[PDB]
Amino acid sequence: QLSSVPAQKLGWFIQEYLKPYEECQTLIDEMVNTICDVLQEPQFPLVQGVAIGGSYGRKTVLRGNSDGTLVLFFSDLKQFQDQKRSQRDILDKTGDKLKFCLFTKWLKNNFEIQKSLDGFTIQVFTKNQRISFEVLAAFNALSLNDNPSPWIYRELKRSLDKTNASPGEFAVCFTELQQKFFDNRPGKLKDLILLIKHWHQQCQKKIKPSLSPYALELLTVYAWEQGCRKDNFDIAEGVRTVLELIKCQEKLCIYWMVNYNFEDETIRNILLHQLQSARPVILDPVDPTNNVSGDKICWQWLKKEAQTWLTSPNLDNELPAPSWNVLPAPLFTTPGHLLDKFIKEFLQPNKCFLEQIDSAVNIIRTFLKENCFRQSTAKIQIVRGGSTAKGTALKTGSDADLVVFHNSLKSYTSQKNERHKIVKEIHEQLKAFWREKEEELEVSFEPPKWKAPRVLSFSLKSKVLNESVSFDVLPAFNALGTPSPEVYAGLIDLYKSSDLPGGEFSTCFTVLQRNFIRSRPTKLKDLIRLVKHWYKECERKLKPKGSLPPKYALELLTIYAWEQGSGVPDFDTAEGFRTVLELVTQYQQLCIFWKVNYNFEDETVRKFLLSQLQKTRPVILDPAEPTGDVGGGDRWCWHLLAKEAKEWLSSPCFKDGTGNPIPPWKVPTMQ
Amino acid sequence: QLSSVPAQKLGWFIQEYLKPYEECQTLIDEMVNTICDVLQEPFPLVQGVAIGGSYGRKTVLRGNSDGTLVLFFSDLKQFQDQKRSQRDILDKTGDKLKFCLFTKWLKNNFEIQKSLDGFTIQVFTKNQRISFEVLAAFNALSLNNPSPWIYRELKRSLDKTNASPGEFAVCFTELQQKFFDNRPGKLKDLILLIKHWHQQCQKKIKPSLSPYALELLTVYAWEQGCRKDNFDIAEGVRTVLELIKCQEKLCIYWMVNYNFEDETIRNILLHQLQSARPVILDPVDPTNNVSGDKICWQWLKKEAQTWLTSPNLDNELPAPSWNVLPAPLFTTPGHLLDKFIKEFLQPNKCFLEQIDSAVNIIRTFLKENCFRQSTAKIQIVRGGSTAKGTALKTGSDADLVVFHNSLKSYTSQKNERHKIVKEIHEQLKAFWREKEEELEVSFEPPKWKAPRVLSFSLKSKVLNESVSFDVLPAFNALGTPSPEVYAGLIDLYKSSDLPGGEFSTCFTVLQRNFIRSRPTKLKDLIRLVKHWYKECERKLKPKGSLPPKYALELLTIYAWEQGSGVPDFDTAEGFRTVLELVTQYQQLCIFWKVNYNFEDETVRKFLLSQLQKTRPVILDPAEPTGDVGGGDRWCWHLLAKEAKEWLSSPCFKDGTGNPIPPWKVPTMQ
Ligand SMILES: [Zn+2]
């Protein structure tokens, strides 16, 4: 069945065959609630409570016969070592003997309590849906507090070392957290998990090792959380993303920080021991010791089945196959001598695609420059800037500026009507271009989407890859017309009168920014890619907690780190990155500027430049523009990046193959 | 009519008499839309229109009502283009055209009317009549969003022409719409009621004041009071009338469109803030002080007194009203700080005596009734901001720390703590059943949820003041303490880097005894600094996690102990020194050897590791693990920027106008 269904209508296939009937759900969940109530009446004096685990506990049940557990927290279980007191199977057998005699209300028709080793099991069934609850007894480890505070995991590690160590055997104690991690998530994410489990069951059915579905449930949750936080995604992107992750099984290493952190040294040493292991490494959200991935041999079969389904003609039907961008292994886990491989494999965009968008953008520039003004004698001049014009774009979220210079604009400010006219006519000419030239480009073109107050934007997409670049169109005063100080006196006469944030006129000087980072060694552009990725990973979790300083400040720290540390075309990337995290740690003393375009030679430039150098302790003046002050002194949450850098200095990335630490370069902090 | 309506059912009275009919509104607004469309068809000089007045703000009363609409003629290009009268010629041509230009039904409901300095147009429908003043303006906003350069160009033009403060304010009418459109419906109903009352006062008395001043005052009353989009309208009325009665103090302003950042604007605001009060700066033009003739506020005071004291208000003895200050601390001169603290920040002494008498009854009843079966009784210790003498008039809090023998360690005791708090909840319910009339203060029944802290509040019978207590089971660590107790805490933290102080409540007695018994002058400075912090938190909390309030109480004590250990001092120098220390947040390292000391083998070993922490570090004098001034953890950077802004304040200028210097306090100790 499954492989014959096209990628479109998979949501229908899931609704038609996999998802449980709402009728059976609304009977069984009342059955289970009644069971949970009856086991908690004082009848059963020994229970503190119950918690529900397995596929039922996670709310991921399939239409068929299905997995579940429920855990009884007996009050004589008070320590982790009580998990080893196996004689509680006697207690479970008494619980069975009692429970089977209750059969309360109508439910006597639908229970079937059954004898089993190491305690009983209760099945619950209905016309279609059937649940097979494994019954277990455990210490409620969570009752040591009301949250997974670090002392709980410290007591866990101590208990593991005191008894005979058996990693993950006590994970059952945390079943309450396992519910909390899987509720309040989108319905489509559940439907995707059901589809992935159904495929796994088909693979288990035809192949004749074993792997628990919880590993692929975690993998699917990680795929969604990293790739597409939207609650209305396309399931056919989800499947392709998960199968791409499974194909990477020898790299795969996924973990969550939702219940535990690298803060406590006792947990940090556990995570650093586990994260540095045989990939596929799958740490569960609730127990730092419980590596969920099964026998390595089973992932070989899952690879072969992933290849087989992913290459089928029912997938792979789009010209580029759409999928989310997720890394099999976060940067933190990669050893220091593998950084140069990591950058080349995951961060660099494809060279042929950049050549294609360069060829396309010169066509865009040529078509616009001739057509936008025909009545007026003054033509627009379009200059290309941003992260694709210099060679430092990432494979994801690339950007570009098309700065548009024109004679309508007489000053940096007070010209909104002229800029609106320039944008409107560029929008009209881009529409005419899309009408006339659609098949002459070797890249796909999104039609411009625009509204009167917003910036123009359009995107160029590969025809054979997922990569894309987004351009935005920015009218600017042609200040430049290295520049002589009579141009900078124009900016200075705006700011000299008051304290203000800098740099809103940055786009006027885009050529000096591009020419500052371009022509530098490719090794340094790759280090700039690495630092921009590290910053992107910081923003992913610190943005809820503050406004981080702008990325260009760390691009400038990366260049200052190279120029001061070692001005050589080839170097160890791990020492460069370690030095950048050193400079970010030293944020308390940041005095950086470059006398490339502006110097103390002029009477007003010197007067202004000697002022900004005393504005605030952190100061990183844009080499294109003295008012730029992009390392803003007192406004931005530098502290958060300094705390995160101080955390990252523990990373595997900064340990050599011998295991000894990698030192920073000796860079001055004031310059 | 109005004065006979009780405070309850004012919402009914507003719905019954004041609010316009929706059946009428749904014609007039389409009439105005059609007029605005016709005026924007090239009428080739009209770049656009914006609607001002009571219609523009969406505050129209049922009857005849005020409005304007502004025409942005394309030849108007600088502020001084307001001054050339020829706009009346252009208006008279626009009149001549627009009187002939009519469409569909609308000829039955327009009435264009000749007027001096340009025409006017009326629009009327069943039970309604809008009158529009028609004006010409340079659309100053077209320059940028109200960016600093716009107000710099404004001030330059104002000085270049024959200066006329507020005369260019018509240019900003689009911002005046943007400030009023989004706000909650009941705030509109309150504004309608306040305007109807003002019209009744204008009717019987026989100066004048424009309603925009009282509309701004009502918006400020709501924005400073309850931010809630649902409220009792009679609290709104009572707090607005209380603000009007304070007319000689009143000074209200907004930072929504302009800031003290740009020196050209800062000098305007500092000039305006120090003016005849009631000072009412409008949200959109820093020069447009909206308050009318000073004489009119005398009449408004007398009418506020008359209505507020009526038997239809003032019916509930603890008459509820939102606590809003007539004048923000920033506006008060330095030599008036000692008066400001005493007038607005100190709670009433008799109320504190009453809650002290009541809480000793609570403690006695709980201590005897809770464990009757067990031999071990609970011990209840009172702590927090009311036990030391540093509570504010608003948002006071206190801890009832409960010590018991069930608790054998700082951690892993949740069931015992749940039992203790559950039975305290039961005994507080029994107390409320038995003793409700023996207290001289009102008691809220405890409101509780199984995982949450238990809490209850004591309220005055005769004032709005209140105190909130919460009940906190704690390990009886103390049982000055000898180091064998601190070795217990140290053996938890020594093994790892962690945030500190989660066990702070165990040492509450050492915290209270540190701030208590200090001079009352220093407790009033602590009140002032806690108010400054509360005002910083009011606007910076959306932007980051501010450092905890207890850190600034310790900076205030360190500032006094180092600056001048004398029972009386200038409060303005103390506050200036606290803002100095907050500016030098990079260097704190502030601690006190009052309880712990280096005279031990483990405490010294831990404390020399605590001293070797982030440069900004403040150690709770009660507890070496307290470390209440965290480093990167907190958003100190923001308070150090706000302090640098506050150093311009009138509070730090003497009566001669010279600046007040800080005390010479060391930053490392
Ligand atoms: Zn912050």
UniProtKB/Swiss-Prot annotation, chain B:
GO terms for molecular function: 2'-5'-oligoadenylate synthetase activity; ATP binding; double-stranded RNA binding; metal ion binding. The keyword Repeat applies. Keywords: Acetylation, Antiviral defense, ATP-binding, Cytoplasm, Glycoprotein, Immunity, Innate immunity, Lipoprotein, Magnesium, Metal-binding, Myristate, Nucleotide-binding, Nucleotidyltransferase, Repeat, RNA-binding, Transferase. ATP binds at residues 385, 527, 530. Its main location: cytoplasm. Changing residue 399 to A: Loss of activity. Pfam families: NTP_transf_2, OAS1_C. Produced as a latent enzyme which is activated by double stranded RNA (dsRNA) generated during the course of viral infection. The dsRNA activator must be at least 15 nucleotides long, and no modification of the 2'-hydroxyl group is tolerated. ssRNA or dsDNA do not act as activators. Strongly inhibited by copper, iron and zinc ions. Partially inhibited by cobalt and nickel ions. Mg(2+) binds at residues 397, 399, 470. Gene3D superfamilies: 2'-5'-oligoadenylate synthetase 1, domain 2, Beta Polymerase, domain 2. Myristoylation is not essential for its activity. It is found in: Cytoplasm; Cytoplasm, Perinuclear region. Changing residue 470 to A: Loss of activity. It catalyses: 3 ATP = 5'-triphosphoadenylyl-(2'->5')-adenylyl-(2'->5')-adenosine + 2 diphosphate. Interferon-induced, dsRNA-activated antiviral enzyme which plays a critical role in cellular innate antiviral response. Activated by detection of double stranded RNA (dsRNA): polymerizes higher oligomers of 2'-5'-oligoadenylates (2-5A) from ATP which then bind to the inactive monomeric form of ribonuclease L (RNASEL) leading to its dimerization and subsequent activation. Activation of RNASEL leads to degradation of cellular as well as viral RNA, resulting in the inhibition of protein synthesis, thus terminating viral replication. This is 2'-5'-oligoadenylate synthase 2. The lineage of its organism: Eukaryota, Metazoa, Chordata, Craniata, Vertebrata. The gene is OAS2.
